[model samples]
Target: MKVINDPIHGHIELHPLLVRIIDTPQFQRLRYIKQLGGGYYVFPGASHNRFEHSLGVGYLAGCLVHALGEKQPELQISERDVLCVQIAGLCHDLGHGPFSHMFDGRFIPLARPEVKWTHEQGSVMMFEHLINSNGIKPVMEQYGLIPEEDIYFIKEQIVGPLESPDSLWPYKGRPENKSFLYEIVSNKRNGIDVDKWDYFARDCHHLGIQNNFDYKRFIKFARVCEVDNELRICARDKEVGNLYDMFHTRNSLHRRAYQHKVGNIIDTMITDAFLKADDYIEITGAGGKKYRISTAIDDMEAYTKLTDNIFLEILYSTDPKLKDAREILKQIEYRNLFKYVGETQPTGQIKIKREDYESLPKEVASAKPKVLLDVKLKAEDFIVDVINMDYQEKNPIDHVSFYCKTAPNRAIRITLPEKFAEQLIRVYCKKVDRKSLYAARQYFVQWCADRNFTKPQDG
Candidate 1:
């Protein structure tokens, strides 16, 4: 066993087996893998790696599971479940490629027309491969940990074929009765989740965003309940502020760290570079080393070969082909990213003008710009309804139910604030002609400037 001190989560204790897994070259490769990838090019301090973040997640998972166990001893969450969650956390981002999500455009196509595997899928595949190939079994045996169904359940929950009724065993099965374990693991968008909680804290710390949310309060007050047989997650009445804190933190990070104009431009350049290199059949495969050399090799490898520092060095190198990539890289390195345009909320029945469509890139001309609608949780999307499991009655928010302090029944009503909801509707409904979309994006940049949203601050 090894114990490491973590700045975000305090002390993290690693089982010997887990430690062995971490020591593998495959896992350690994450040290060089940036969590936010190209975002760091915009937010200078945003340069943390997936390796450290994964460890932090594992630590958080262990803490949450332990806390749950203490709160609800009858839940019977086995030691195996705890280890499974930790393992899942450790391997979650393992499949992320050289530049992480920034390189998704480069890799997603290769696996397509069959099943598109995201980094998460790749992580699951890697886990299965490791276990099936006996890469991880010895470690489990050494720790006297028998491979339990719970381990597989955790994997399925994280990366799903949605197989096995027991696949979601801890959280699934009871549409009428919710389980504490289910609430924590499977509920994707409940305001507060492992994914949201981890990223908010991690991103803020790395980006030096002093306005981050207080995670301790949020985590402490989060709870799970059974509505009908379905498991639902909820924040205690006093914890609503914590939820708001998380939402606001995410909103701020997206506005600051993620959607930075320079970051977008660099992402665009990288995507273009990879697309141009798509002809190089050799280098275009699943693994890192198989590509045949040509213009494609030179183009794609230009970005792949360099780490953050190496990237800057290569950008200024004497190579001619790398000039374009290098210039963009240089601009990003220096934070001289392009300006943002205008910002608007588009709602129902909104349509983009033909003139706007004509103004965008020819490639995007045919693209239909739909609003990026995001709902935290909608009743219609869930497989099970927490409020009415017997099919005898219908409830507006049926997907999951929350425990109400005022009501005798533990029924929670969920509705987005009308103002934000209106904005969301407009954003999703507004149509952008390809050209107009680009113009609108530029307009968004201008809006940010007008609002002083892009004011650079000391890190």
Candidate 2:
């Protein structure tokens, strides 16, 4: 009965149950979290937050699942299944910390190197927190969802099994017959799901980038079929072009906005600020346990209160302890950013040769080229970023399965693309000065030459 007027999706009519979930503080925190993290600083129009994106995802999740059920009746899609899928979509991003991916991707990794964490893992954690803290279980049960089984289904859809056993159908929630249901929210098979569908359209719309793929058309063409004894969502053969365009859209978004040079540096600067303030700032969690900025992920309750507002909190702080963090934020405002020295690719086997010479021969000392022997810059002077433009190291197009109009049940894949996967090995000088820039570039050039990697242009 609740309707949300979303810009991306015209009118999102939410399930009564979803309204309850959305009304909670934990879910509402997404309103303050920017969808693109540091990209917002780069793209002026990227003011969109995770709240709307999550809503769009939930709406689209309902759209796709309802479409499949109505078109293919024998799929046996139940109300419980549909509700779970929608909830999974709505709450999939529940675990995302302040500034979206920056908290989990950069800050957490740097601060807690020993602890393994991801937004998906955090989403699962946060989803549980939201449900428990808000007493949403009873309401979920009122809507024909068994909390035990359906909760597992929702979590599994957001992320795969929490605990995987030896059995084939290891899901405690649903049977293998409903395997295709898992693909609705977060598609692990080929990364084609409602999550990307919503984000692609929503992000492109906000970032001012033209979206090539049409999820509406995709939804129309989508159908469930058995592929290798498991039901997976397959697209029409002719839609292969559309699917490829989807992957292309992903690459364009990453290069054009998500990984923008200035935007990335802003992310780094913000991370640097967080690192400085990690020990100083404290967040009170359940049972009054305190967590620092990076350690907030360990406590779901504390993370619920954490959002992008921390940036301003640290920026405007009068505390002398936060002076260093505040200065970094001020630099961002003043446009004093890091310097990008150069970039290169790997052309062949890469190996760094190190020399250990206790004493050089009298003749060799003079003969040894100064270029080879001299080290102008230390490792700490520069930051090397290996940015991958593709989906999780592999070509996503290769993993996608398609179906022909003539044979709707069989899943098939098309040919490859023009080197969709490539890493840009970039070196950035920490200190922005003429001398430091020259030294960093020269040092990077020497390393690339020694390893036989591709030459760095303009280094």
Candidate 3:
């Protein structure tokens, strides 16, 4: 047994099996991966890393499993089941690159367009590497994790199906009974699992914002029941308010920290620097040869060293080949960041005859919402982010289940309006030249007679 003293979760007691996994160099790499990524540039305290978040998630996973074990043991939640959930939580983020989401979101989409990759997919890749190593595999079996059965269970929990028809999921070959355990680490049904619960609380603490939900209380109220002929985790109806607060916290963090305009611009700048430095930087690893920065995902040996410090590596390097990227990062350090011009909803509908252009000719309005703004190459390079409202036409909130003292085991889900929630259509830009910012803004207004879409509203 290993006890990790964490700030967010008090003291997290790790299973001996987990200790072997966590102590490995692969898990420790998360120490340097930022939890909030570019938000650290905006919120100083937002410097928490993936290492701690993994620990928090692992801790919370254990807490939830233990609670279920004690409160509703008929589900047969065992120590082995508990360990697997913690492992899934701990190693869930191993695949994230230097800047977290930006690595997968902005960089990979541009850097490796030929290949489709996601951080979740990478986590499974790294987890397999970590366990298959000479030192870790023995410990896995010692803790009752048989290589074929237990290892697959852990990976399945982490990344759904490793491969195949997607039907192999829920791992038909394995115990197949503990379907609720998968929900704890990565909840597909409601998305209100231990992962969200941990980050919502953890990010709130760092961003110095209020986290309105109580995970501990929610855990106390949680129960497992048969729904759709499969075991699912359910909660009491009285705690529905807490669940709302959980998602409310997610919404607040995204708006306040994750999607802040200035922070996003910085992220874009870092991404550009990384792309520039990719050719110059070579990460040498256990693979016995150097790999290009873009192939970090392919090699765990390279991945281990590709943490947040690489940002420092790029900024402080004296390599002449890296001078251009270094200069860009230097601009960021000195507060000479990218300029935010303006944004419009990407849906380019709703064009009005410009009062200025109306005199020239009454241009027929296009019924389709075409792109609101067009940037001709005559101007400098620009960036646009159409920040959409985070919800679906049929949101998971409508599908959540609960059993209350007032009523037992029927649909106690919230109204489905969160489904039709209005989308936030906005754009961001870092124009190549500052002088062109105002001209571009005016040019956008000229394209669409209405000025409201392209301009940022004052708080």
- Candidate with best lDDT: 2
- Residue 419 error, candidate 1, Å: 9.2
Ten contiguous residues with the weakest lDDT in model 3: 358-367
lDDT of each: 0.51, 0.80, 0.72
The candidate maximizing TM-score is 2
For residues 1-459, what per-residue lDDT tens digits would candidate 1 score against the true structure? 798988777778997767877876557667887788777766778778888888887777766777666666665666766777677667776666656765443333432213344566656655565565446776686665656554565566566434545344433322224244443433443434465567678888888885446767755655555555654555566555555565567667765766554565565444434433334323343345454322222222322232233343445566575565566556555755433333233333333322232122322222322443222212111110001011122232234344555652364666511121222101111232344335444333333334334322221
Give the distance in Å from residue 241's predicted Cα in candidate 3 to where it truly belongs. 1.3
As for lDDT, the candidate ahead, 2 or 3, is: 2
lDDT of 2 by residue, 391-439 (tens): 4345566667788888888777567245454755666666786876766
At residue 306, give the lDDT of candidate 3: 86
lDDT agreement of model 1 with the native: 0.51
Q: Estimate each model's TM-score.
A: 0.67, 0.90, 0.85
lDDT, residue 264, candidate 2: 76
Instruction: Report the candidate with higher TM-score, 1 versus 3.
Output: 3
Candidates 1 and 2, the one with greater lDDT: 2
TM-score of 1: 0.67
